[PDB]
């Protein structure tokens, strides 16, 4: 179902944003 | 008829409050609606990537390039380049390119969208329809509609969102709900495939029936109507030119009282960017499933009667939706507000084009600039742009198979990437010179025309009747050429300018992103707490956009 794909996308991109958040710090 | 007449009477009598309205109106206009619905019908959901990438581009604009435009003090793009580079030559050529892009995309698509809306309603063929729309726009402008457009934009966007939500509610009901879209769409095909014309011959099943992967946003990279590797980067380049270089967009964005208010307006605009998918792409394919024979035909003999072009006129889906699926009385409200928004956008583009031409081209040509003669030049420029845009309509309706939004993306991806490269290199690297940037940009323009002119002279036809174009010239996607032109024009401007050290650091104080804050005199080449909550709101909105992307992707 598409909702699991959307959840995976959110998890992956939130992890990416969290990783990038250390660049400024 | 009553509602439309009353709405026009009110509009003519009248003639994040403005920021959100202007941002949405540029983002989602009348021509934008018709093109989005058309390509949604022909190709499927995949065109939604356009909106869902323009969302990220708007966020990037608000977070990065608006402060650059604000610290320097340049409201517009060309004067920022004037202070960054110097010399009327580069600004003159950039103004010429902006004029050409306005003529090729803004005015032409606005007039053609008006013609599509009128053609499937009361009225006549394309010529009479655009003549009537010209009359409407002229009567709008004469009565000072643009002066009150700032106040009317919020009302127009609010009523457009309301009507589009009503259409959302009605469409799935007329199909049978959300299950109907996943159930019926893939079986939407015309009953007519005989092709009585001997030259055309029997059409294969590839053309009239829809593409098997018409649901998914991500198409095949090599062989497909709209690849995603092209999508993600080429949309970034084209919409970075669109949002971060348009004078009106930056003027509206910087109009906020404070920087945090600008960011809040950007977030609200993002909220209004996530909705036009469900408002446009879904109802277009709903109109396709409702009316399979009328909306998307493939036989030229019937096509000329239905469409006016042999391509297929997949872009007339939304006019049919409005004039059939709507309740009988209320359809006038849509047919009125749609045209009112289109006329307002057309008038804004007209005024911006005339002001740009007067400010740069005739100003450099004739330094005297008598006010009466200058106003006469402005009026004659408006006449000339109208004539050229109307003369360009037969090419607009073809639009590489009838997809109107494909034409916009193609033209912009042909002529915008050089300007995007010049702007990005000017903002990032300090080495680029005025002569270097100009000499790279002229070469980029030549490279773009070297693929545009032969393609438009040869044609595109359709799947049934492809043009006799060389394989290398047309097999490349109309948007991958933007990716190539980015690293051709930018390479030229970076190589030519690197020939020498043309500009010291003193000329580029607080104008280059590297030296964002210097607290020093320029060389004259002429919320402490709200920020974290705003960043959190942006994170939530961007995460929701990614959630939708992964849902359909």
Q: What is the CATH number of the domain that holds B541?
A: 1.20.1730.10
Q: Cα B161 vs. chain centroid, distance in angstroms? A: 19
Way it was determined: cryo-EM
Can you tell me the distance from the alpha carbon of B536 to that of B540, in angstroms, rounded to the nearest whole number? 6
CB contact under 8 A, A6 and B551: yes
CB contact under 8 A, A2 and B551: yes
Q: Cα-atom radius of gyration of chain B, to the nearest Å?
A: 23
**Residues within 8 A of B (CB atoms), A 2-21 only:** 2-3, 5-10, 13-14, 17
B25 assigned binding-site residue: yes
CB contact under 8 A, A10 and B548: no
- How many cross-chain Cβ pairs, A to B, lie less than 8 Å apart? 29
Choosing among A10, A16, A18, A21, which should be mutated to test the B contact, i.e. which has the most B CBs within 10 A? A10
Choose among A7, A9, A17: nearest Cβ to B539: A17
Can you tell me the distance from the alpha carbon of B336 to that of B548, in angstroms, rounded to the nearest whole number? 32
- B477 Cβ neighbours under 8 A, 6+ residues apart: B227, B230
Do B104 and B393 meet the contact criterion of CB atoms below 8 Å apart?
no
- B161 Cβ neighbours under 8 A, 6+ residues apart: B272, B275, B279
Residue B464 buriedness (CB in 10 A; 0-12 / 13-18 / 19+): buried
Structure tokens at B88: 């009327």
Region of B370 on the Ramachandran plot (φ > 0 left; ψ -120 to 50 alpha; else beta) = beta
Place of tokens 């920022």: B80
Give the number of domains in chain B.
1
Can you tell me the distance from the alpha carbon of B307 to that of B120, in angstroms, rounded to the nearest whole number? 10
Secondary structure of B332-357 as H, E, C letters: HHHHHHHHHHHHHHHHHHHHHHHHHH
- What would the DSSP string read from start to end of B219-254? B-SSSSSSBHHHHHHHHHHHHHHHHHH-HHHHHHHH
Do B381 and B355 meet the contact criterion of CB atoms below 8 Å apart?
no
Among the listed residues B203, B173, B176, B177, the one whose alpha carbon sits nearest the alpha carbon of residue B190? B203
B195 assigned binding-site residue: no
Place of tokens 């005199």: B521
Question: Sign (positive/negative) of CA torsion B397, B401, B402, B407?
Answer: negative
Q: How many CB atoms lie within 10 A of CB B196?
A: 10
User: B546 contacts in A (CB within 8 Å)?
Assistant: 9-10, 13
CB contact under 8 A, B543 and A13: yes
B341 assigned binding-site residue: yes
State the resolution, in angstroms.
Answer: 3.5
B108 assigned binding-site residue: no
Range of the domain at B162: 1-552
C-alpha distance from residue B181 to each of B40, B42, B161, B190, B355 (Å):
13, 15, 22, 17, 46
B344 assigned binding-site residue: yes
C-alpha distance from residue B499 to each of B233, B431, B435, B502 (Å):
29, 10, 11, 9
User: B549 contacts in A (CB within 8 Å)?
Assistant: 6, 9
Place of tokens 């608000």: B62
Structure tokens at B70: 């604000």
Choose among A3, A9, A14: nearest Cβ to B549: A9
State which residue of chain B sits closest to A4, comparing Cα positions: B551
Choosing among B45, B532, B535, B550, which should be mutated to test the A contact, i.e. which has the most A CBs within 10 A? B550
Q: What is the largest CA-CA distance in chain B?
A: 76
C-alpha distance from residue B481 to each of B49, B244, B473, B486 (Å):
18, 21, 10, 8
State which residue of chain B sits closest to A18, comparing Cα positions: B539
Helix (H) or strand (E) holding B205: helix B205-208
- B465 Cβ neighbours under 8 A, 6+ residues apart: B200, B300, B310
- B136 Cβ neighbours under 8 A, 6+ residues apart: B339, B343
Output phi, psi for B479, to 5 deg. Answer: -115, -25
CB contact under 8 A, A10 and B550: yes
Range of the domain at A22: 1-25
- What would the DSSP string read from start to end of B386-438? HHHHHHTHHHHHHTTTS-HHHHHHHHHHHHHHHHHHHHHHHHH-TT--HHHHH
Can you tell me the distance from the alpha carbon of B508 to that of B72, in angstroms, rounded to the nearest whole number? 10
Question: Sign (positive/negative) of CA torsion B136, B140, B146, B148?
Answer: negative
CB contact under 8 A, A10 and B546: yes
Structure tokens at B35: 């093109």
**Measured between CA atoms, how close is A23 to chain B, in angstroms?**
16
Residues in chain B, overall count: 553
Structure tokens at B42: 């022909």
Structure tokens at B9: 């009477």
C-alpha distance from residue B161 to each of B28, B107, B171, B274, B513 (Å):
10, 24, 15, 12, 38
B13 touches chain A (CB under 8 A): no
Give the number of domains in chain A.
1
Can you tell me the distance from the alpha carbon of B272 to that of B282, in angstroms, rounded to the nearest whole number? 16
Paired residues of B227 in beta bridges: B219
Can you tell me the distance from the alpha carbon of B26 to that of B61, in angstroms, rounded to the nearest whole number? 14
Q: Cα-atom radius of gyration of chain A, to the nearest Å?
A: 11
Can you tell me the distance from the alpha carbon of B514 to that of B534, in angstroms, rounded to the nearest whole number? 25
Can you tell me the distance from the alpha carbon of B249 to that of B255, in angstroms, rounded to the nearest whole number? 10
């Amino acid at each position: 179902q598409p909702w699991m794909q959307g959840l995976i996308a959110v998890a992956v991109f939130l992890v990416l944003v969290a990783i990038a958040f250390a660049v400024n710090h | 008829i009553l509602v439309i007449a009353a709405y026009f009477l009110l509009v003519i009598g009248v003639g994040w409050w403005p920021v959100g309205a202007s941002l949405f109106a540029s983002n989602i206009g009348s021509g934008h609606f018709v093109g989005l619905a058309g390509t949604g019908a022909a190709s499927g959901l995949a065109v939604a990537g356009f909106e869902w990438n323009a969302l990220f581009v708007v966020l990037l604009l608000g977070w990065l390039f608006a402060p650059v435009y604000l610290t320097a003090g340049v409201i517009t793009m060309p004067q920022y380049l004037r202070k960054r580079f110097g010399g009327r030559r580069i600004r003159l050529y950039l103004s010429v390119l902006s004029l050409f892009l306005y003529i090729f995309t803004k005015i032409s698509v606005d007039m053609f969208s008006g013609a599509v809306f009128i053609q499937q309603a009361l009225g006549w063929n394309i010529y009479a329809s655009v003549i009537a729309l010209l009359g409407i726009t002229m009567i709008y402008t004469v009565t000072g509609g643009l002066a009150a457009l700032m106040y009317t934009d919020t009302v127009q966007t609010f009523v457009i969102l309301g009507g589009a939500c009503i259409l959302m509610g009605y469409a799935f009901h007329e199909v049978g709900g959300y299950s109907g879209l996943f159930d019926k769409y893939l079986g939407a095909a015309t009953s007519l495939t005989v092709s009585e014309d001997p030259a055309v011959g029997n059409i294969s099943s590839f053309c009239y029936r829809p593409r098997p992967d018409s649901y998914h946003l991500l198409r095949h990279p090599v062989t497909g109507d709209l690849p995603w590797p092209a999508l993600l980067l080429g949309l970034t380049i084209v919409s970075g030119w669109y949002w971060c270089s348009d004078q009106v967009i930056v003027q509206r964005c910087l109009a906020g009282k404070s920087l945090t208010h600008i960011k809040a307006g950007c977030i609200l605009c993002g909220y209004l960017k996530l909705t036009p998918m469900f408002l446009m792409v879904m109802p277009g394919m709903i109109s396709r499933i409702l009316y399979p024979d009328e909306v998307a035909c493939v036989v030229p003999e019937v096509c000329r009667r239905v469409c006016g072009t042999e391509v297929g006129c997949s872009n007339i889906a939304y006019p049919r939706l409005v004039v059939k699926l709507m309740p009988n009385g209320l359809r006038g409200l849509m047919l009125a507000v749609m045209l009112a928004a289109l006329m307002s956008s057309l008038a804004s583009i007209f005024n911006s084009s005339s002001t740009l031409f007067t400010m740069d081209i005739y100003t450099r040509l004739r330094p005297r600039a008598g006010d009466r003669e200058l106003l006469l030049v402005g009026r004659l420029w408006v006449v000339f742009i109208v004539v050229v845009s109307v003369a360009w309509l037969p090419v607009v309706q073809a639009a590489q198979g009838g997809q109107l939004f494909d034409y916009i993306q193609a033209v912009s991806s042909y002529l915008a990437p050089p300007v995007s490269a010049v702007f990005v290199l000017a903002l990032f690297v300090p080495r680029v010179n005025e002569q270097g940037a100009f000499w790279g940009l002229i070469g980029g323009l030549l490279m773009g025309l070297a693929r545009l002119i032969p393609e438009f002279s040869f044609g595109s036809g359709s799947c049934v009747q492809p043009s006799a174009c060389p394989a290398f010239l047309c097999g490349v996607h109309y948007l991958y050429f933007a990716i190539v032109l980015f690293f051709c024009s930018g390479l030229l401007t970076l190589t030519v300018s690197l020939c020498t050290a043309p500009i010291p650091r003193k000329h580029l104080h607080r104008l280059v992103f590297s030296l964002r804050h210097s607290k020093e005199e320029r060389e004259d080449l002429d919320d402490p707490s709200w920020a974290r909550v705003v960043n959190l709101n942006a994170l939530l909105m961007m995460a929701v956009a990614v959630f939708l992307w992964g849902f359909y992707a």
